[PDB]
Amino acid sequence: NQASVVANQLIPINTALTLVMMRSEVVTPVGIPADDIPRLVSMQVNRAVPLGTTLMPDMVKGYAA
């Protein structure tokens, strides 16, 4: 049902998110909702996020729904 943000490339640690890094997919478990992609632009991740990984709230510095 619900789509989440998934890494479209490896996202390195302490690197600001851009649109080319984030795709939407229906995955389980559910992560950050796909609708939040625009909000995530320029926010940094606190760990490296491998290709195909679902972005979870705890991975993004400053993220609160």
List the chain domain ranges.
1-65
What is the CATH T-level fold of the domain 1-65, as seen in this structure?
Answer: Type Iii Antifreeze Protein Isoform Hplc 12 (3.90.1210)
- The beta strand positions in 1-65, using DSSP E, are 4-7, 22-25
For residue 45 the two structure tokens come to 């991740």
Helices H / strands E in the chain, number of each: 1, 2
Task: Give the separation between CA 11 and CA 30, rounded to whole angstroms.
Answer: 19
Q: Which residues contact 17 (CB under 8 A, 6 or more apart)?
A: 11, 40, 41, 42, 43, 44, 45, 60
CA dist list (Å): 14 to 4, 25, 50: 21, 24, 14
Task: Give the separation between CA 5 and CA 21, rounded to whole angstroms.
Answer: 10
Q: What determination technique applies here?
A: X-ray
- Report the largest interatomic distance among the alpha carbons of the chain, rounded to a whole angstrom: 31
Resolution (A): 1.0
Write phi, then psi, for 20 (nearest 5 degrees): -70, -15
